Design an enzyme around this catalytic site. Sequence first.
Site, PDB file in Angstrom:
ATOM      1  N   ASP A 137       0.446  -9.630 -10.656  1.00 52.30           N
ATOM      2  CA  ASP A 137      -0.145  -9.677  -9.355  1.00 52.30           C
ATOM      3  C   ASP A 137      -0.645  -7.889  -9.441  1.00 52.30           C
ATOM      4  O   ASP A 137      -2.032  -8.210  -8.504  1.00 52.30           O
ATOM      5  CB  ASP A 137       0.005 -10.573  -8.366  1.00 52.30           C
ATOM      6  CG  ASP A 137      -0.134 -11.626  -8.520  1.00 52.30           C
ATOM      7  OD1 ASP A 137       0.985 -12.421  -8.287  1.00 52.30           O
ATOM      8  OD2 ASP A 137      -0.722 -12.578  -9.747  1.00 52.30           O
ATOM      9  N   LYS A 173      -0.917   5.525   2.981  1.00 51.63           N
ATOM     10  CA  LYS A 173      -0.408   3.998   3.351  1.00 51.63           C
ATOM     11  C   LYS A 173       0.497   3.780   3.695  1.00 51.63           C
ATOM     12  O   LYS A 173       1.458   3.541   3.631  1.00 51.63           O
ATOM     13  CB  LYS A 173      -0.456   3.534   1.758  1.00 51.63           C
TER      14      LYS A 173
HETATM   15  C1  LIG Z   1      -1.606   4.486  -6.631  1.00 44.93           C
HETATM   16  N1  LIG Z   1      -1.782   3.941  -5.281  1.00 44.93           N
HETATM   17  C2  LIG Z   1      -1.741   3.142  -4.530  1.00 44.93           C
HETATM   18  O1  LIG Z   1      -0.857   2.216  -5.268  1.00 44.93           O
HETATM   19  C3  LIG Z   1      -2.949   2.142  -3.863  1.00 44.93           C
HETATM   20  C4  LIG Z   1      -2.095   2.887  -2.510  1.00 44.93           C
HETATM   21  C5  LIG Z   1      -0.338   2.628  -2.746  1.00 44.93           C
HETATM   22  C6  LIG Z   1       1.026   2.857  -1.481  1.00 44.93           C
HETATM   23  C7  LIG Z   1       1.296   2.219  -1.871  1.00 44.93           C
HETATM   24  C8  LIG Z   1       1.213   1.125  -1.242  1.00 44.93           C
HETATM   25  C9  LIG Z   1      -0.014   1.032  -1.632  1.00 44.93           C
HETATM   26  N2  LIG Z   1      -3.780   3.190  -4.004  1.00 44.93           N
HETATM   27  C10 LIG Z   1      -5.146   2.101  -3.559  1.00 44.93           C
HETATM   28  C11 LIG Z   1      -5.073   2.278  -2.177  1.00 44.93           C
HETATM   29  C12 LIG Z   1      -5.856   0.568  -1.337  1.00 44.93           C
HETATM   30  C13 LIG Z   1      -5.124  -0.038  -2.299  1.00 44.93           C
HETATM   31  C14 LIG Z   1      -4.811   0.490  -3.328  1.00 44.93           C
HETATM   32  C15 LIG Z   1      -4.154   4.107  -4.576  1.00 44.93           C
HETATM   33  N3  LIG Z   1      -5.732   4.109  -4.134  1.00 44.93           N
HETATM   34  C16 LIG Z   1      -5.992   5.762  -4.456  1.00 44.93           C
HETATM   35  N4  LIG Z   1      -6.797   6.826  -4.202  1.00 44.93           N
HETATM   36  C17 LIG Z   1      -8.021   6.590  -3.329  1.00 44.93           C
HETATM   37  C18 LIG Z   1      -8.197   4.921  -3.924  1.00 44.93           C
HETATM   38  C19 LIG Z   1      -9.757   4.031  -3.686  1.00 44.93           C
HETATM   39 CL1  LIG Z   1      -9.504   2.083  -4.120  1.00 44.93          CL
HETATM   40  C20 LIG Z   1     -10.611   5.087  -2.859  1.00 44.93           C
HETATM   41  O2  LIG Z   1     -11.613   4.307  -2.202  1.00 44.93           O
HETATM   42  C21 LIG Z   1     -10.178   6.374  -2.137  1.00 44.93           C
HETATM   43 CL2  LIG Z   1     -11.249   7.963  -1.310  1.00 44.93          CL
HETATM   44  C22 LIG Z   1      -9.174   6.784  -2.875  1.00 44.93           C
HETATM   45  N5  LIG Z   1      -4.931   6.425  -5.035  1.00 44.93           N
HETATM   46  C23 LIG Z   1      -3.674   6.181  -5.379  1.00 44.93           C
HETATM   47  C24 LIG Z   1      -3.154   4.934  -5.402  1.00 44.93           C
END
Ligand SMILES: CN1C(=O)[C@@H](CC2CCCC2)N(C2CCCC2)c2nc(Nc3cc(Cl)c(O)c(Cl)c3)ncc21
Lengths: 300, 307
Positions: B224, B119
Amino acid sequence: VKLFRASEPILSVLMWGVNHTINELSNVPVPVMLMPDDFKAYSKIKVDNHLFNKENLPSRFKFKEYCPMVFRNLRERFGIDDQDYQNSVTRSAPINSDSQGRCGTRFLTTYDRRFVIKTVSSEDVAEMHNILKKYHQFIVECHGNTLLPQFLGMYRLTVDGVETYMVVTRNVFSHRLTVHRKYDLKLHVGEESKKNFLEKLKRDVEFLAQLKIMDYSLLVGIHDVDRAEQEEMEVEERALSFPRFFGPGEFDPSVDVYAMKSHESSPKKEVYFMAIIDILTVNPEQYSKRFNEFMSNILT
Amino acid sequence: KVKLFRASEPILSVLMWGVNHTINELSNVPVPVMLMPDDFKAYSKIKVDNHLFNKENLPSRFKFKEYCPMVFRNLRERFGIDDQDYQNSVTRSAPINSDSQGRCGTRFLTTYDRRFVIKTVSSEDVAEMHNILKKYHQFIVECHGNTLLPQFLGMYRLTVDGVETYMVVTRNVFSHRLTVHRKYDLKGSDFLGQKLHVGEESKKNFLEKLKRDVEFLAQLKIMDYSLLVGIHDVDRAEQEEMEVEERAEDEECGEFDPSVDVYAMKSHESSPKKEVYFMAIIDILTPTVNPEQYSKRFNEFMSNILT
Ligand SMILES: CN1C(=O)[C@@H](CC2CCCC2)N(C2CCCC2)c2nc(Nc3cc(Cl)c(O)c(Cl)c3)ncc21
């Protein structure tokens, strides 16, 4: 697990530099042929670590590698495996060796005496670029069979805002028989050795002429077998994945490519090593001719 | 043998090159018996200025920086991720775009094998991480790698064509094989009725994990954050994805490993229809009550959602 554990820090930087650029090359594919732009090429790398990996390496340094594609291909043509060259430089700190010419300043050898690391001037570096494409061509047509230096890499290291230039070559002397005497000339061998030696010498000198170079010299190491036995015995009682065997007068000519055995019909048995030395730092064709005359008659 | 770091974008080539470079470098540094305080302010930095060399996929000139190589290396092993495996996911083939979500609709990558999430982040997020890392690290040790919190794996800064990108790497909350049909981001106080039915060990295991996690975010003064819920529907996948793997492999151009998909839970053995669930706490950084009350409000609501 390669700590680039060494005496001088510049040496650590050399080990890390060779390891990196060789790994880096493993992910570039070998071309069908080299291109004009490979002779103008380099790779620079600036490192500025902080509170990490400082145990042996300086925290900050630069490492430039001149014409990486060319020296990979030369290595191939001298039959030197890239993983091998990398291991000689990186398994253990290179060590101070004696001298093999008046060329530059500091002389070093990889810990296994396979490769020689010379420190060179900036003017030397330029001369290398001047000559590198016609050298490369010369190596192609002689099938890597020369008495010329066999250049394997060329690097600029910077530690503490100081630049050092280094050139890596194949050792002229055996990486396993010690050299008891050296001669630097600006002797009875087999007729095969003698014919072959004169063949190389004729071309090598002529190429050096057409490249307008003079003042190079022939280096001659002599290994005394009888002496090596006496000096084996003397330190005996005071004490190749597995250890390669070898008899007394004996070497591998794929490895120790400059070596000649003394003729069988000859008193004390010996290994000679003769190379053309100091290609960098009468007209040249005249010097060529006179050099051909002289070193010819050293031999029977 | 052979990694030509080919990717749609140079920034991605550069991420692939740097992960390869930094993981190699680390293999030549002994695993210390304990991280020292100075390992947390540490970084690796590298500037490449190639000229007419290695130009086919990689940019001539670029910079790569890794924050806290020892710390993250440690975290990686605490999470049971092999550095070798981590390098492969990033380097074997280019990371890809996602199914995608956010709150402003955030854009993220996945490693080609859908095992890890990358990310793009801000300069200020990198700082947030630094502030929490030492405690985050302490926390990861104390629960032995068992959390719903983001499992953080790497933190980088790339610079290409004069532009600096920050990226953070984490374990994927979602399975790398089973498709997620339904997503929900429970942002505090689609379920409030729709109950979620799982095995007893799975239910008690989820709850205690949740309990320490929120406590931890509280004893750091964070709020949050939200609960990310993915549902995979077994029957639906059989209907929609029957002959898809096979037809990928032709002429022209409800089980999981708990070891890999760590956030997964099967639907209860005697339950409406066959489903797999994925719950994690997400958004821990910076992409009216107090944090210790927000904690109680979170543990309450997310408890009520499982029976
Ligand atoms: C632990 N983790 C997160 O913390 C965040 C990304 C973070 C990286 C450092 C700050 C943002 N996230 C999310 C990504 C955007 C912010 C929350 C995640 N998405 C996924 N996999 C995922 C999630 C969605 Cl919503 C999806 O549609 C698919 Cl195909 C895979 N797996 C894990 C996470």
